[PDB]
Amino acid sequence: MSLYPIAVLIDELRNEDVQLRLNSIKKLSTIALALGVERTRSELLPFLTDTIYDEDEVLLALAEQLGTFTTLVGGPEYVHCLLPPLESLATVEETVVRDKAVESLRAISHEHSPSDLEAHFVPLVKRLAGGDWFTSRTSACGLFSVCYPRVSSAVKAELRQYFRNLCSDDTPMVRRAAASKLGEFAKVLELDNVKSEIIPMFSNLASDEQDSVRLLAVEACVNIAQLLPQEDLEALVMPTLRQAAEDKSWRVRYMVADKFTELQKAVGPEITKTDLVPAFQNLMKDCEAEVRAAASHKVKEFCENLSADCRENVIMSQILPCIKELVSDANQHVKSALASVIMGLSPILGKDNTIEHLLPLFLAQLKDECPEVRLNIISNLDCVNEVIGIRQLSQSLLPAIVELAEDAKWRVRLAIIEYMPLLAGQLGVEFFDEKLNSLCMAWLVDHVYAIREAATSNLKKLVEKFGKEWAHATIIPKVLAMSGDPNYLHRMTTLFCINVLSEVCGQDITTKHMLPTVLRMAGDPVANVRFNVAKSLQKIGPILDNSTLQSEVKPILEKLTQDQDVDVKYFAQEALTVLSLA
Amino acid sequence: DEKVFTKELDQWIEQLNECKQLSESQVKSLCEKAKEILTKESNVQEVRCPVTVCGDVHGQFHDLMELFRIGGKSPDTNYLFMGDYVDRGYYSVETVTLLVALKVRYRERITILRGNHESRQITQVYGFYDECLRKYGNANVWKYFTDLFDYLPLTALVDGQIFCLHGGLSPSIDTLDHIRALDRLQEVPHEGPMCDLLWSDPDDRGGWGISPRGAGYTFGQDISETFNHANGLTLVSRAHQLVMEGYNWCHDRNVVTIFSAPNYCYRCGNQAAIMELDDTLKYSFLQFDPAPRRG
Amino acid sequence: SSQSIPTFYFPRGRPSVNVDAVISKIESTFARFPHERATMDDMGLVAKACGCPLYWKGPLFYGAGGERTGSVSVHKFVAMWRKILQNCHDDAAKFVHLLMSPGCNYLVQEDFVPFLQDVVNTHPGLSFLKEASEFHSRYITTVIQRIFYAVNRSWSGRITCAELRRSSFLQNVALLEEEADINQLTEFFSYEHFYVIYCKFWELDTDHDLLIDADDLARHNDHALSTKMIDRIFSGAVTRGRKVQKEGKISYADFVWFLISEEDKKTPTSIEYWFRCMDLDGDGALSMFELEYFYEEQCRRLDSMAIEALPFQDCLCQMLDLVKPRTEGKITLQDLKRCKLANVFFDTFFNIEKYL
Ligand SMILES: [Ca+2]
Ligand SMILES: [Ca+2]
Ligand SMILES: [Mn+2]
Ligand SMILES: [Mn+2]
Helix, strand or coil: CCCHHHHHHHHHHHCCCHHHHHHHHHCHHHHHHHHCHHHHHHHHHHHHHHCCCCCHHHHHHHHHHHCCCHHHHCCHHHHHHHHHHHHHHCCCCCHHHHHHHHHHHHHHHCCCCHHHHHHHHHHHHHHHHCCCCHHHHHHHHCCHHHHCCCCCHHHHHHHHHHHHHHHCCCCHHHHHHHHHHHHHHHCCCCHHHHHHHHHHHHHHHHCCCCHHHHCCHHHHHHHHHHHCCHHHHHHHCHHHHHHHHCCCCHHHHHHHHHCHHHHHHHHCHHHHHHHHHHHHHHHHCCCCHHHHHHHHHHHHHHHHCCCCCCHHHHHHHHHHHHHHHHCCCCCHHHHHHHHCCHHHHHHHHHHHHHHHHHHHHHHHHHCCCCHHHHHHHHCCCHHHHHHCCHHHCHHHHHHHHHHHHCCCCHHHHHHHHHHHHHHHHHHCHHHHHHHHHHHHHHHCCCCCHHHHHHHHHHHHHHHHHHCHHHHHHHCHHHHHHHHHCCCHHHHHHHHHHHHHHCCCCHHHHHHHHCHHHHHHHCCCCCHHHHHHHHHHHHHHHHHCCHHHHHHHHHHHHHHHCCCCCHHHHHHHHHHHHHCCCC | CHHHHHHHHHHHHHHHHCCCCCCHHHHHHHHHHHHHHHCCCCCEEEECCCEEEECCCCCCHHHHHHHHHHHCCCCCCCEEECCCCCCCCCCHHHHHHHHHHHHHHCCCCEEECCCCCCCHHHHHHHCHHHHHHHHHCCCHHHHHHHHHHCCCCCEEEECCCEEEECCCCCCCCCCHHHHHHCCCCCCCCCCCHHHHHHHCEECCCCCEEECCCCCCEEECHHHHHHHHHHHCCCEEEECCCCCCCCEEEECCCCEEEECCCCCHHHCCCCCEEEEEECCCCCEEEEEECCCCCCC | CCCCCCCCCCCCCCCCCCHHHHHHHHHHHHCCCHHHEECHHHHHHHHHHCCCCHHHHHHHHHHCCHHHCCCEEHHHHHHHHHHHHHHCCCHHHHHHHHHCCCCCCEECHHHHHHHHHHHHHHCHHHHHHCCCCHHHHHHHHHHHHHHHHHHCCCCCCCEEHHHHHHCCHHHHHHHCCCCCCHHHCCCCCCHHHHHHHHHHHHCCCCCCCCEEEHHHHHHHHHHCECHHHHHHHCCCCCCCCCHHHHHCEEEHHHHHHHHHHHHCCCCHHHHHHHHHHHCCCCCCEECHHHHHHHHHHHHHHHHCCCCCCCCHHHHHHHHHHHHCCCCCCCEEHHHHHHHCCHHHHHHHHHEHHHHC
16 A cells, blocks of 8 residues: 555556556556545546557456456445446457457446446447447447346336347348347346247348358357247247258358257257258258368267167168268368267267277278378277277278378378377387387488477377386487487487486486487587587486586586587586586 | 677577567667678688578568478578578568578578678569568668678588589689689679679570579589589589479589478469588488468 | 545646736737727737637637627637636647537537638638639548548547547648648648549549449449449448448548548558458458458459469468468457558458559
8 A cells, every 4th residue: 555656557557658558557456446446436437438548458458457346446336437438448449349348347237236227237238239330239239138137127128129129230240249149138038038029030130141140040049949948949949940051151051060069959859859860961961061071070979969769770870871971071171070070989889880880981081091081080099999999900000100100291290290199008018119119210310300309209208108117128229329320410319309308217317328428429520419418418417416417517518618619618608507517 | 798698699589480570779789790790701601511501581481480390490400591581571571680690699500691682672672671661660670681781691612512602603703712702792783793693593505695584694504514623513502593392403413403482472382492411411302381370 | 545646637637827918918919900809810810819820710710709790809709718728738628629519528520610611711722712612612521531530540420639639630730821832731631632532532423412332432443442342331331320331322521531541551540441341240350251252252353354363272371471460360450450561461352453
């Protein structure tokens, strides 16, 4: 409560520098606390309302602060004092601050008494809903659901009218905004108002000229179906959903595929069986790749939530034949979207069906031309491993892993490198030593530096799974052998490997088995190796005992400080000083 | 206090890797320091192997980052850039500043040669002037960089045997000594030996011809051989000309063209490439596509 | 508390001025006039006695009620200027309080008319325009649009003291008396800029109703703007109310905003204008769908000229380099303002002439 720095913070609300403006805004709580409730009302809030800011971060942070200001303005009796600055912010050009302003208005609404909602909050929504700019009408949309439950019947009827007006606005941006809020507004209306008022609106927006509006009707579907009795769904929701699923716009068909599981849950197992599965099959056979891909991504979840009584059968007779087609879809994104979820069907179908019907699909995708498809299969073995031994698939995984490891394109090589630790844990240390070790060592001498770097980082992760003993036995000798490579790019890689290995191999292995090579490399003919010796000694130094630093490391670094190359002098000096050897 | 400036330069480099320009005064300071370093370098700058040789970048900052992903980071890997850092792309500023900041920080780890686009007249029409004006609001940064370009070496010689330069041969130069006698410290002329080193192209025609570009010459296999044998060279390594493969051998391997701006101007569809020369000067090539930016 | 943090919000405005000395000076100036009444012809002198720039003379005469009978008494003029001096503490506040409707504290388009009328009657650069005429009225409308274009950055249609203060408008009012060539004042008052603007309108409004439709607007600069974009002008993205969306016609005033935005796309106002037009769903981000929707037409237009268009993906990549969005997956208003090549971005999606 020392007040001068607070007087400074207030002053800096209007500083030329955005950074100071931002700092003050973020400390508005501190300022209001020191002013007390009266002055934060009579000075602080009007002061803020009349300042023009044009910076997103500042406006955002202001809108956020005001949402928390209830106690600071004197409690619920005075919350309505926050309406005017928030009403402006819900009106600026930048959409993101408008959204924050409505989020804060929504938070503050709960602090309004019912009569304060009617006296202050509702007129704000009306002014916004009646605004000249679509932009303020957009804001209004997010504000109905918070004030509706707690006002009188007469006010509720006005709100329903205002909302109907937004749904049929001459500007499509506003219709879109209303569509997006239909579901949440429906969640607060009386059930018979949902039936008589929400359904017509829902049906109108579902047949809008703009597909931007139409596509939002599938999410409204989800919310409306959740609220409605199951036996009202065929009458009130299904005809609109069926229309959405075969809409001329791929974007709306897409949304039904994207939301398919939620529809499945809301609509219930009976409607799912008779209506949704034929719909799902159609989505899988859609003329547009993006829709088939979205559908493909849902096969697991969809099959998983069918009722127990119909599950196996509808999968076998209805879904599986579609899945077989999709495995040879001409579009790669579709094949790879399926690849990433398909083996998740393994436990759902049990051992026998997996072997007979899924395994061929698994192998086919594993032999696929597209690396993304093979990568998606290879990285999702966890589910099939429960039902069938992952060790039983080794013979098929091996050639696929090798082929990706040596792919002409380095980002493909990077992708398989990143899954290597996962694969090493699932296949076991024995299979790894036998079949994969040489693959991992070959990447350390890849032509592409990014691959070398990823491979050196891979070794650390391998050590964390298999231990420092395995590292000393199977990894380190091959790493040190590279110190004799005629190409300096490869000799440096030894030092980079030592860098990461000493984080996990411990003081003894580092000291006895890695450090002698580092010290020896200080006499390398190329300066880049010599200065990376210095850098490595700095890096690993804290794993080394103080005696070692003193008797072995210090003398080498001292020698390096008298090299003819400027960078080796510099990094030797740095090493000496950060290790406290100077 | 050399300690403190080193720390400052490391953060400039770090900031530039996040694709953020330096301020006008930082650029001014960086350029004074680079002039002081470049002024000690020869018109035929001696470079030791191992070194990785790169061609044109033309402000393609995101592809320069990709290049570093392929060749390794400075200072760990040594680089020789053959010019054309600036113009055409959207990030000429961040591109030249990164490279001269690396030269100033690591003068033995990197060599930067002059391209035909590091020139007052060419930058005024091919984008670099305009980029600097937008990013700084006045013409000073442009002035500082174009004054500095005057100091950039014209050619390099790696290990006595591999001659690197941006453009190509000139009928006004028979010997490396003739190059060393030139005065490099001026704007690139429209004609003469200096111009030719930065403008000429190798050709399928025999002897010398006139460049279709409007400056410099074309030269054929017979010219490259005479020049190499007379100067004790293994190879002329050069840039300047887009090649679809990123690199291209010609003249019975007396000449190689290396071009390091993939999908040049979002239009040309080429791979990019760099040339690694290892500890005993053996060559190898690394081809690359533009970095993804996806979202 | 109330000592350490002194009062910092002044509904009034804060600051020192010797009002009685100004009143005294006004009084002896009026003592030069017959019946101590000033005509509009005397208001230059009066303006100077108040310490105002010459071209405040119109607003000063009008504020005092002068136009009613064509003269104003010393008593009435003094009464209103004292009130200004007592309650307005900078030029912006003074100017708004002269022109505004009572208790408004903001200026609407109509409030600027008396000022501009005086400008048109007085400035030597505009003498050929003194008479009532079509050009006389259009010039006034055009200048006022250009005032709101630069000053009214909130798009509210109400110019505020704060907004006035943040602009160069008053500086320009002051310069009117220093520049005899009105084309030297390029920001608001330029006659030649008005003439270009009006000609561009005139040649589209072939029935001369002061109303232009999508077919008309499509003809502009040999159909340089794409049809998908022309359509968005009529969507409610850039106009107040419901009239435009229902009629598919815009007024002359609206056309001035379109034309100025189209001539110069680097401007904070213009960037806002075109972003509103491009953001089909109004969610605050240009999505891949929204960009593709405009770009397919550019492609069909380049085709017709036997020029091969960049495929959408190469174009998108270039545009992401060009704008360098804050967060991946979204191009936003802020990204477009910060990038400084918004004009190149916009032309790529909807202007054939200028993209080439
Ligand atoms: Ca008309
Ligand atoms: Ca959008
Ligand atoms: Mn060149
Ligand atoms: Mn070039």
